[PDB]
């Protein structure tokens, strides 16, 4: 398990339709990842013409694509599963996520941002949640594209929604140890 300032990323493609969270999670369960990568700057897309075709995944992942384990072949539909840790002080936070299609983010195993359906690009300000103890918190994310356009940018606020930040190498850890 390598130590890096990012989340462990897995990409999965399929030629079946992804309509909701359950469909993507079942894809993840069904096989080994089509590619792995380091998710160090979680602000992906936008692009067009299906994330799972050609080099669209590379374009979507941008600054993280150089860590891809392989170049997946074509599929119609696809998505990502990210997992690891995020340093957060105790306090109150909320996500604001821009996405096409849907997604789910969990912290310490509890959902904190959910869109359980397909959608063209849309930004949701999610409800707040609490962190009870400062440190590295467990975090995971799924996102998918059913086809067409694709974008995924979760941002996080620690100040009641006045300012938001991207999750990146400043605060992410793949294993929960401090990355240097
Ligand atoms: O990206 C597409 C968008 O272009 C629209 O067709 C609605 O579904 C989304 O998945
Ligand atoms: Ca799997
Ligand atoms: Ca490809
Ligand atoms: Ca980019
Ligand atoms: Ca859970
Ligand atoms: Ca589809
Ligand atoms: Ca789409």
The DSSP symbol for 2 reads -
Give the Å distance between the CA of 108 and the centre of ligand 5. 8
Structural domain total, the chain: 1
Q: How far apart are CA 97 and CA 67, in angstroms?
A: 24
**HSE-up of residue 99 (Cα within 13 Å, Cβ side):** 30
Cβ contacts of 29 within 8 Å, gap of 6 or more = none
Cβ atoms of 109 and 137 within 8 Å: the answer is: no
On whether 1 is known to bind a ligand per the annotation, the reply is: yes
Domain hosting 97: range is 1-180
Experimental method: X-ray
How far apart CA 44 and CA 27 sit, in angstroms, is 21
Å from CA of 74 to ligand 5 middle: 31
Q: Is 122 annotated as a binding residue?
A: no
CA distance 159 to 108: 20
SS3 state at 24: helix
Distance 101 CA to ligand 6 centre (A): 11
Burial group, residue 160, by CB count within 10 angstroms (0-12, 13-18, 19+): exposed
- Looking from the CA of residue 145, the nearest atom of ligand 1 is 10
């Amino acid at each position: 398990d390598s130590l890096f300032a990012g989340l462990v990323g897995e990409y999965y493609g399929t030629n079946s339709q992804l309509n909701n969270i359950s469909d993507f999670r079942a894809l993840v369960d069904s096989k080994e990842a089509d590619a792995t990568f380091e998710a160090a700057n979680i602000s992906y897309g936008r692009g067009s013409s299906d994330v799972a075709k050609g080099t669209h995944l590379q374009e979507f992942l941008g600054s993280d694509a150089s860590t891809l384990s392989t170049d997946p072949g074509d599929n119609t539909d696809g998505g990502i599963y990210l997992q690891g840790y995020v340093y957060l002080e105790a306090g109150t936070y909320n996500f604001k996520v821009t996405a096409d299609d849907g997604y789910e983010i969990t912290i310490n195993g509890n959902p904190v941002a959910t869109v359980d359906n397909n959608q063209s690009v849309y930004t949701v300000t999610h409800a707040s949640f609490t962190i009870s103890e400062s440190g590295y918190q467990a975090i995971d994310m799924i996102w998918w594209d059913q086809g067409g356009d694709y974008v995924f940018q979760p941002t996080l606020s620690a100040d009641g929604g006045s300012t938001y930040f991207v999750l990146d190498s400043a605060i992410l850890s793949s294993t929960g140890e401090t990355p240097y």
